[PDB]
Amino acid sequence: MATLRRSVEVAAPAADVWTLVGDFSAIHRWHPQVSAPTLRGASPHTPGAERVFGAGTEEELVERLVERDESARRLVYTMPDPPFPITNHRAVLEVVPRDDRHCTVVWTAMFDCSPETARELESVIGDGVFAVGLNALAERYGRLEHHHHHH
């Protein structure tokens, strides 16, 4: 699949999780693989702002906010400078409330990649970057209802 979708069980209300994931610039508050991103113009809540991971190294990542929904808990961005061989990138952050104390945080990433590379990116981007970040977030809200296996 060129379209990736992952979901995690968080022991907390969805709105509290949107206060964490939503910011775009402030992803280094929960996501351990984020080596501090540099937020360029527009403001991080306004559809347009870019975030440059590292910003002084041989391996950086430049992302850009396409559109943002505060009340809907829906965060859409793209990679205008991606290190992975793709054409058009598109990714969304949707925190879906199941109960008042339980919310499923769904991270989606779809990109126009070639099949032999795309199967590899499902494990690297999906079962690597997301399966670490989403799960570490579920562990820090585990102060309400129990910890789980890291990643």
Please tell me the total count of domains within the chain: 1
> What are the angstrom distances between the C-alpha of 23 and each of 12, 20, 51, 85, 129?
18, 7, 11, 27, 18
10 Å Cβ neighbour count for 57? 8
CATH number at residue 70: 3.30.530.20
**Domain that residue 14 falls in:** 1-151
| Distance in angstroms between the alpha carbons of the first and the last residue of the chain | 22
Residue 147, classed as helix, strand or coil, is coil
